[PDB]
């Protein structure tokens, strides 16, 4: 068995850098390390084999490099599609052994969230249960802090947060945060408030409605 | 083109048996070696097992040998793995490759082990110079749903989060697009939702 160390677990840089990821082997495999690229929710694609070989049709951008044990891939200028996890892989031996990944984040320029506050729809009522839905738009970087103000009170654990994957056009990252109510307990209290604190705004902006009220 | 086809995915009773399948096209998997490579939900990438078609010699990753079976059969130019005994632990995107490393993998296969049995989605809409409207997809299991806009035609400023697993074991997203005020009216905005693990076709349409 050997192990490949992939460092850094995860790396944020500009449009143009030139991003490096080491691995280093618990033992001599010789030029026996491949590099993938991983798009979110597809296959991996060969990057670079025998240690420093281009695949086929691989941009010109990637480069591959060996010394000792360490193994370097270079991605030279950082393109949008380049938005990735990479991982290093061994085949020296059997079992052949993957390194932990590294996520590759596009750093752009600091974008405050556009808010949007969403009411239960008049469909999920009459079922029993209800959801108060809170949309933070296209915002940058992904630190984000939304608190639920229920008839003024905040809330704890009645909540569960999701965020998109870096869009490819515009770099941005979308949050949702979801606050779930029975039909009674939502029906008792007047205010509804979703507050979101983030790096690109000046001062915590809050939206809310008022239950039913248009 | 070389080509590799996963088949035989979906939701398994813990300890029961599931068949994947590995069709290779446009190559003879005499003259290579196959791997499956799996991925557990938001993890990385795990080698689980190898095989020598010509020969039939086989190796396997140690969190999975003895339960599992990798073969091959040459004159189907086709790879299996034989998972039994499965276990929450192998809920995962199941791969085929081949191999001087992994340069063409299939697709890949959604294995999901649970006892939690079918259920399809409600879809409820979320009301709005831009506005923002979406849907409501909750209490679904398996993974996964699928979420168009205008079957398709609107695309620009979607965002489909992923899914939640809720406390009851049921799964939740929410689709929402960006538009400019101006269009409402103009467009009509319907959310084409399909889980086919339930067979449950739904189209909400969404309106102020």
């Known amino acids: 068995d050997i192990q490949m160390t992939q460092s850094p677990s995860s790396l944020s840089a500009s449009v143009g850098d030139r991003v490096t990821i080491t691995c280093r082997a618990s033992?001599?495999?010789?030029?026996?390390v491949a590099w993938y690229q991983q798009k979110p929710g597809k296959a991996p694609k060969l990057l670079i084999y025998?240690?420093?070989f281009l695949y086929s049709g691989v941009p010109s951008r990637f480069s591959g490099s060996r010394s000792g044990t360490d193994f370097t891939l270079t991605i030279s200028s950082l393109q949008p599609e380049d938005f990735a996890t990479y991982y290093c892989?061994?085949?020296?031996?059997?079992?052949?052994?993957f390194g932990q990944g590294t996520k590759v984040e596009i750093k752009r320029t600091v974008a405050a969230p556009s808010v949007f506050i969403f009411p239960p729809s008049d469909e999920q009522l009459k079922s029993g249960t209800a959801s108060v839905v809170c949309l933070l738009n296209n915002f940058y970087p992904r630190e984000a802090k939304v608190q639920w103000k229920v008839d003024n009170a905040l809330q704890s654990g009645n909540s569960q947060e999701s965020v998109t994957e870096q869009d490819s056009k515009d770099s941005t990252y979308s949050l949702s945060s979801t606050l779930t109510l029975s039909k009674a307990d939502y029906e008792k209290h007047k205010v509804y408030a979703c507050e979101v604190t983030h790096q690109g705004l000046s001062s915590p902006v809050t939206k809310s409605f008022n239950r039913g009220e248009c | 083109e070389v080509q590799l086809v996963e088949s035989g995915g979906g939701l398994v009773q813990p300890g029961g048996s599931l068949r994947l399948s590995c069709a290779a096209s446009?190559?003879?998997?005499?003259?290579?070696?196959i791997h499956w490579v799996r991925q557990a939900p938001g993890k990385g990438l795990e080698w689980v097992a190898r095989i020598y078609p010509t020969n039939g010699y086989t190796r396997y990753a140690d969190s999975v040998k003895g339960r599992f079976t990798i073969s091959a059969d040459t004159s189907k130019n086709t790879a299996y793995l034989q998972m039994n005994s499965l276990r929450a632990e192998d809920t995962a995107v199941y791969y085929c490759?081949?191999?001087?490393?992994?340069?063409?993998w299939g697709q890949g296969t959604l294995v999901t082990v649970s006892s939690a049995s079918t259920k399809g989605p409600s879809v409820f809409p979320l009301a709005p110079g831009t506005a923002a409207l979406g849907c409501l997809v909750k209490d679904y299991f398996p993974e996964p749903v699928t979420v168009s806009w205008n079957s398709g035609a609107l695309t620009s400023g979607v965002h489909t989060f992923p899914a939640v697993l809720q406390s009851s074991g049921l799964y939740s997203l929410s689709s929402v697009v960006t538009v400019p005020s101006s269009s409402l009216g103009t467009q009509t905005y319907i959310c084409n939702v399909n889980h086919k693990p339930s067979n449950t076709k739904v189209d909400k349409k969404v309106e102020p």
């Open positions: 490759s081949r191999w001087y490393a992994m340069d063409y």
């Open positions: 892989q061994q085949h020296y031996t059997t079992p052949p052994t």
């Open positions: 033992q001599d495999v010789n030029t026996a």
């Open positions: 446009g190559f003879n998997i005499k003259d290579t070696y």
């Open positions: 025998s240690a420093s």
